[PDB]
């Protein structure tokens, strides 16, 4: 039953993902390779992160044909199945740490606008991707934890003894999924909260990175931890063991869709790159006092409205747009001067001029602003 379903789902789902990866990941490789020509300090490191992710996923892409050919036969060649599993593991963990470092970079650029000048550098990016390659391959090196001879003889590679002991399961799982998952969650939540405080493309790309990370890594690592909790310190129960084996095998056959799921972060990063409540309520009060100036008779009322409008303009100026807000504050200043002089109708004329200045220079902001922030 479980074996028949295994064979059916494997033969059905490995066929498309190979072509999908070899097409879309290669397209991403080419696109970001052309994008690195721009050579800006902050506009390049992300492209090196993307090319690292694309290479890590292309590893799995090239592994898929080998895993298919070595599994469609009754284990004729047992040496290369270990290589296939090593490729899969290096792919997953390199992808995890690459996307997690991307989230670190985005969070440190958002929360600390000054440190990104000295942090985000193409040399730093090349160094960190090379470093993560080295450590991930070094941690994939000790996969020969079984008996020295014979070696494991199945491509789903359950393995035994010290593999599922705390000496191996924890130092791998905590340092490869749990810590990246936790720190990515913190970074992404803080980034989204800050961006929503400043309020779309950036929110979209952080959300896409977090969603891709969760969907592609949480199931397989949850299955790993569940097997550790079940086959070590929980009764077999037969039914639970069968269900958990089914779940972990499915996550094995569904985590290979990561090479395609990475397109959801690639596309949004590319859209953000092509394109390049605080602001919303600043615009709201600008319009509100602009409209209440018209229905006013006391000079004190128009003075108060102009004061609030000037405060809003000054606050929003810190988020072309520099000069537009400059002339907006200037016109608010003439309106305030006229109101202080005692004239009210002249304040209305100044407010009308302020309205046309806003419609001309300001409306481009709060429109592009609600497309990146």
């Amino acid at each position, epitope marked *: 039953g479980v074996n028949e379903l295994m064979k059916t789902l494997q033969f059905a789902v490995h066929i498309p993902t190979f072509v999908l990866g070899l097409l879309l990941n290669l397209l991403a490789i080419h696109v970001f390779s052309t994008f690195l020509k721009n050579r800006w300090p902050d506009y390049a490191a992300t492209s090196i992160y993307m090319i690292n992710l694309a290479v890590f996923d292309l590893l799995l892409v090239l592994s898929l044909p080998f895993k298919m050919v070595l599994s469609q036969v009754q284990s004729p060649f047992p040496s290369l199945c270990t290589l296939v599993e090593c490729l899969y593991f290096v792919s997953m963990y390199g992808s995890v740490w690459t996307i997690c470092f991307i989230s670190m970079d985005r969070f440190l650029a958002i929360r600390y606008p000054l440190l990104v000048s000295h942090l985000r550098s193409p040399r730093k990016a090349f160094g960190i991707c090379c470093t993560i390659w080295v450590l991930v391959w070094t941690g994939s090196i000790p996969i020969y934890s079984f008996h020295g001879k014979v070696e494991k003889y199945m491509c789903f590679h359950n393995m035994s003894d010290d593999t599922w002991s705390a000496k191996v399961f924890f130092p791998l799982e905590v340092f490869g999924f749990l810590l990246p998952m936790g720190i990515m969650g913190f970074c992404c939540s803080r980034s989204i909260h800050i961006l929503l405080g400043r309020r779309k493309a950036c929110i979209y790309t952080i959300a896409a990175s977090l969603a891709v990370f969760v969907v592609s890594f949480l199931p397989v690592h949850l299955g790993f931890f569940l097997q550790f909790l079940v086959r070590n310190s929980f009764i077999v129960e037969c039914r639970a063991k069968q269900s958990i084996s089914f779940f972990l095998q499915l996550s094995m056959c569904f985590s290979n869709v990561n090479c395609c799921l990475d397109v959801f972060i690639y596309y949004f990063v590319i859209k953000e790159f092509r394109m390049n409540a605080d602001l919303e309520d600043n615009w709201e009060t600008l319009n509100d006092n602009l409209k209440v100036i018209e229905k006013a008779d006391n000079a004190a009322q128009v003075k108060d409205a102009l004061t609030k409008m000037r405060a809003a303009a000054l*606050d929003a100026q810190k988020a072309d747009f520099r000069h537009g807000f400059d002339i907006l504050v200037g016109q608010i*200043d003439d309106a305030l001067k006229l109101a*202080n002089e005692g004239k009210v109708k002249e304040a209305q004329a100044a407010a009308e001029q302020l309205k046309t200045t806003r419609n001309a220079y300001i409306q481009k902001y709060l429109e592009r602003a609600r497309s990146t922030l």
Partner: antibody
Amino acid sequence: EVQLVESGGGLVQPGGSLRLSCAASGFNVRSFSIHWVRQAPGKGLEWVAYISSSSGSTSYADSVKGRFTISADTSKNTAYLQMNSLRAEDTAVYYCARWGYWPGEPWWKAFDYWGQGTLVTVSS
Amino acid sequence: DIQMTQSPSSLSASVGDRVTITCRASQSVSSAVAWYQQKPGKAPKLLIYSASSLYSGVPSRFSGSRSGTDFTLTISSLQPEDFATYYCQQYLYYSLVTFGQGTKVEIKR
């Protein structure tokens, strides 16, 4: 360097008149806004008036409006605040301060270069 | 009309502690806050123009920060020459400039 020297303050009977002339050296009164800030003895700082010779805009605080008239002659690069209808609550040390125009850094530096003060004392 | 109230009316500290003076505005002023230091019998001097910008000519011990409508001044490294009255000013517009009540920093003993 830029300096603001204020002179004129002294003994004035209640209801009298006095004219404090803060003189600007190092810049022009037409490129900066001159404000008057007064400090009652042992009390805090209170804004008095404001003059902008470039635009002719004059403003006064609520507790002073209608009595003192601020003026500035750009030929002499000096600003004059004219005491009128004085009362005992008006005795203080008067500070003439400069303030840049919009836009840019000069406006954001609110009162970078103050004066030296002139003790105006009023009582019968 | 834009009232500015600073909580510590008189704060006592020794030479070498962290001094925090907090200011609150009645209504929103974006960054139009300036901190002035007044030694007795002398004109005030600018310390922190804008919300956090540091004026050129005063030691880097003075720092400012903005939390919405709340403004704070930090003198984290005190010195025998930082004992004076510190004022909080809002300068949203020329005719609406208002000052705080002051904060006299004395010597703890």
